[PDB]
C-alpha cells in the first residue's frame, strides 16, 4: 500500500487478486503442512462458489465495465473438465470414470441370465470392477518403525 510513487514495482500484488490475506500468507509460509492442508481444504470448499460466480453471473461490468473483483487470478475453474463443472454436468461425470477409491478395469460386456425360459440378455460396455481375490501378495517380513 505505502509506495513512493504512483507507478512502482511491488511484489505480493497477487495477494489482492487471490483470497489470501497478508496474515494468511505469513501463516501459510511459517506454520507448516497442517496450515497448508487446512488452506487446501478451504480452497476446495470455496471452489464451487467461485465456479458459479464466474459461470452464471456476467452482467455488464463489476464497476461499469472496468476493474477486477476478488478471485480473478484463479482461472483453474474455467476449464470445462474441472471438478465443480464436472459435478454440475452429470455426463462428464460418466466420462471421467477413474475413481481414486475403486478398482476399475475398464469396459466389458455383461451377460445377465434369467431363471425362467432361460433367456439371456446382453449388455453393452459398462464399468467393470476388478475381482477382489487378485490381491494375494504379502511382504516376507514386517518391522516396527525404528
Amino acid at each position: 500500500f505505502h509506495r513512493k510513487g504512483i507507478n512502482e514495482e511491488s511484489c505480493f500484488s497477487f495477494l489482492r487478486f487471490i483470497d489470501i490475506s497478508p496474515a494468511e500468507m505469513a501463516n501459510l509460509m511459517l506454520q507448516g503442512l497442517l496450515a497448508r492442508w487446512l488452506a487446501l481444504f478451504l480452497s476446495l470448499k470455496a471452489s464451487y462458489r467461485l465456479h458459479q460466480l464466474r459461470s452464471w453471473g456476467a452482467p455488464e461490468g463489476e464497476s461499469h465495465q472496468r476493474y477486477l473483483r476478488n478471485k480473478d487470478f484463479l482461472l483453474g475453474v474455467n476449464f470445462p473438465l474441472s471438478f465443480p463443472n464436472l459435478c454440475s454436468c452429470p455426463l462428464l461425470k460418466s466420462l471421467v470414470f477413474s475413481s481414486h477409491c475403486k478398482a476399475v478395469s475398464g469396459y466389458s460386456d455383461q451377460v445377465v441370465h434369467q431363471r425362467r425360459s432361460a433367456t439371456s440378455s446382453l449388455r453393452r460396455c459398462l464399468l467393470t470392477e476388478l475381482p477382489s481375490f487378485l490381491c494375494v501378495a504379502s511382504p516376507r517380513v514386517t518391522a516396527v518403525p525404528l
Binding site: 497448508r36 452464471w56 454440475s88 466420462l95 477413474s98 475413481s99 481414486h100
Partner: protein, 443 residues
Amino acid sequence: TQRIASHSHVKGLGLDESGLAKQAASGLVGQENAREACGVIVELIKSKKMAGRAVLLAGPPGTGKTALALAIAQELGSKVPFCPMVGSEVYSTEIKKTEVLMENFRRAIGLRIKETKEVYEGEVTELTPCETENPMGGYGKTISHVIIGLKTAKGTKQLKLDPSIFESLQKERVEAGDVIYIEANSGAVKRQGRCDTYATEFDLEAEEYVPLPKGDVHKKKEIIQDVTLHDLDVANARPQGGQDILSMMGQLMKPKKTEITDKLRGEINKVVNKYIDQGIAELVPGVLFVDEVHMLDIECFTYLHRALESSIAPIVIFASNRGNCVIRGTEDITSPHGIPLDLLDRVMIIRTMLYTPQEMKQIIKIRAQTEGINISEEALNHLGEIGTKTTLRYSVQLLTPANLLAKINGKDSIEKEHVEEISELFYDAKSSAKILADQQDKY
C-alpha cells in the same frame, strides 16, 4: 490495440472456386503451386476420412513455409484443433520423448458435447416445513415437505422440496438473508453468503456480501463444450477429489507428468465410441504442425514411424529448412532435410521456392500497410533493392525503425534518407560475417 506480430497479415491462401491460386490475395503473394497443394491438404483435413497422413514443406529459410501453415490454420477456422510444436519440445526432463509426442498427437483431436444446466437459485426468505395434519401410529407428526421461498431481481416464488433437504440445510448455515442455489440434476444445496442488502446493518462483519441475483429464480440453459482427447487422459490419470489422503497428498506434492499407459486410452476410446454411437458427442479431427522437425531425434523418428499408420492419429504437417545434414542421434548418417529416408517415404513433399523482387516488394508493401506505415515509392523501391541484395527478412525488419526516425524528424512518411540512415546504422548477417572474417585475430 492488439500488438503487431510477425505473421499478422496472413489471413488465408486466397484460392478460387476451382482451386487456382490468385497472384495476391489474403496477404499471400506467389507460391501458387504451394498454395494449391495447401488447399488440397485443407480439403483432405475437412474430408474427415484419412488419418496419419503427413506433408513436409521443404524450402530455403525465409520462403514462407511457416506462413503457409498458419494460412492453413486460418482457412480451417476455429472449431478444429490446430496444435503447433517445435522440434525441441520433445526433450523433457520429466517424461520420455515418445510420450511427449503421443500426448501432442492426442492433443490435436477434439470433442464437442452438449448438455443442459438446470438450477434453482436466489435469496432465501422463509423455511416452512409444511406438515400433513394426522401423524401415523406411534409418532406425533408426519412432515410432508418443505416450502422454501426464493426471490431474485425478477420476482419471488415458493418451491416444494423433499424433507431430507432440511438435513442438508442444517449441515451448512442456512438462515434467512442468505443466497442459495440447488442443482436440479444433482439435488444438493450450497450457500454463497448474505445479501448485499443487509451489508449496512453492522460496521464490521467477518463475512463478505454478494449481490442479489438478477434474472429468473429457476434458470435452464443449453451449453456445448469442447475438450481435446488429451484432456480426458490427464483428467483420468489424476483424479481431482478431496475426500482422500491420496488425492490430497498428490494435490499437495509437486505435480509431475506421468507416462500414460496404453490401457487408459483403450477405455477412453471405447467410451467415446459408445457416446458417439448414442449421438451425444461429435468428434472433430484436427491438425498438428511440427516446425523445425530437423531438431527431432532418431528415436523420435522411429516412433513416428509406427505412430503414422495408426487409425486414430491426426493429420501432421512437418516443416524443415535443412540441406544434406547429419541426423540427430547418429554419428555421420547424412540425409536430406536431416530426416531419415525411411520416414521420408511416408510424407508428401511440398517444395517452396525463392521470391522474385516484384513479389518481395509486394510483400514489403503489404507488411507496411498492415503495420500502419506510409512509405514513398522512391524509398519503397530502394528498400526492395536492399532486401533483394541480402534477404527479405532484413528488408521487412527495417520498416519500423525508419518510421520512428521519420516521426522523430517530424515527417509522416519514410523517404530515401531515413532508409539509408537506418541501413547505415544496423547490419545484416553477410556484412557482419565479413567483418568477423576480417577481424578473426581479435575475437
